[PDB]
């Protein structure tokens, strides 16, 4: 965990009901405290996401980023500009004075669009997350994740002249234990793609949205945090070097052995009734 960058997840209106209310009510001082607390808890990057139908995302993004820059305790770490809308990202870039990180670009809309965005990002001197998503869809399997990332690396480095050290691949952290058997290997697929990327795509980082993994256990916060700790323990060993996380938790070492076995059975897909057994533990705890 010495070489792991924690990206604070909490300034995200779709990911935090509190953050959404604060922004909507214009309590920007309080919203900014959430950023500050994450920096105090070790976050070295702050993810900001204003995408909600109640909000003018672009304007909230520029307001919040400008406010961050006014607060030395927060402006000392980079901001990750998190939007599905390009106009929001570009407002964020124009707005920020220091290096920022785009979250994200992908091949979803085709190669010409990807290249155009990458070129704008490079002109701003920004780093970028690249989602493992191409013209064929979201990369779910390890093979798909590797296919999209290798192609994206090649395009970025060879056609855009993009600095490889400024590329952050997100091979997609997807929920497990969903009741759909086709999802059971999703953490293992991520971990496998992570290993390949760090061995084969020189200089590129690997990150992921860790909290998405545990979506099936909403309302069992211990189980979610235990899942996160287990996933990070195995992903970091393959070279995951960043992650979007709630930086405020449960340590891998502290998980009782029989509980660990159940969490690892799910995360590492070690038996087909793993989800069922973990759901049983989760019900007993609440
Ligand atoms: C989708 N995911 C993601 C990702 O996987 N990869 C990148 N690059 N960027 C992103 N950005 C958005 C997201 C990462 N951020 C997240 C992901 C999940 C949560 C989350 O689980 N929040 C809780 C609600 C917590 C609350 O409201 O108190 C939930 O149960 O929904 C909170 C923030
Ligand atoms: K919340
Ligand atoms: K969480
Ligand atoms: Na909106």
Automatic annotation (TrEMBL):
Residues 4-264 form the Pterin-binding domain. Transmembrane segments: none annotated. It comes from the Bacteria. Catalyzes the transfer of a methyl group from methyl-cobalamin to homocysteine, yielding enzyme-bound cob(I)alamin and methionine. Subsequently, remethylates the cofactor using methyltetrahydrofolate. Modular enzyme with four functionally distinct domains. The isolated Hcy-binding domain catalyzes methyl transfer from free methylcobalamin to homocysteine. The Hcy-binding domain in association with the pterin-binding domain catalyzes the methylation of cob(I)alamin by methyltetrahydrofolate and the methylation of homocysteine. The B12-binding domain binds the cofactor. The AdoMet activation domain binds S-adenosyl-L-methionine. Under aerobic conditions cob(I)alamin can be converted to inactive cob(II)alamin. Belongs to the vitamin-B12 dependent methionine synthase family. This is Methionine synthase. It comes from Bacteroides thetaiotaomicron (strain ATCC 29148 / DSM 2079 / JCM 5827 / CCUG 10774 / NCTC 10582 / VPI-5482 / E50). The chain holds residues 350 to 636 of 915 of the full protein.
């Amino acid at each position: 965990e010495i070489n792991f960058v924690n990206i604070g997840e909490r300034c995200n209106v779709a990911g935090s009901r509190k953050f959404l209310r604060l922004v909507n009510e214009k309590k920007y001082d309080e919203a900014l405290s959430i950023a500050r607390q994450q920096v105090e808890d070790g976050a070295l990057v702050i993810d900001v996401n204003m995408d909600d139908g109640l909000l003018d995302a672009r304007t909230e993004m520029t307001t919040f980023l400008n406010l961050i820059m006014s607060e030395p305790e927060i402006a000392r770490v980079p901001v990750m500009i998190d939007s599905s809308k390009w106009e929001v990202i570009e407002a964020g870039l124009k707005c920020l004075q220091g290096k920022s990180i785009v979250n994200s670009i992908s091949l979803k809309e085709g190669e010409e669009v990807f290249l155009e965005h990458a070129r704008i990002i490079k002109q701003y001197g920004a780093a970028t997350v690249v989602m493992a998503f191409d013209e064929k869809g979201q990369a779910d399997t390890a093979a798909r994740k590797i296919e999209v990332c290798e192609r994206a690396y090649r395009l970025l480095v060879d056609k855009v002249g993009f600095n490889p050290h400024d590329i952050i691949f997100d091979p997609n952290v997807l929920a497990v234990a969903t009741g759909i058997e086709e999802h059971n290997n999703y953490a293992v697929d991520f971990i496998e793609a992570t290993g390949w990327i760090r061995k084969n795509l020189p200089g590129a980082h690997v990150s992921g949205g860790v909290s998405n993994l545990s979506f099936s256990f909403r309302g069992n916060n211990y189980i979610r945090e235990a899942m996160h700790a287990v996933f990070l323990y195995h992903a970091i060993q393959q070279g995951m070097d960043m992650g979007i996380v709630n930086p405020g938790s449960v340590l891998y070492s502290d998980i009782p052995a029989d509980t660990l076995e159940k969490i690892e059975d799910v995360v590492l897909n070690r038996r087909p009734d793993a989800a069922e057994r973990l759901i049983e533990l989760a019900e007993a705890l609440k």
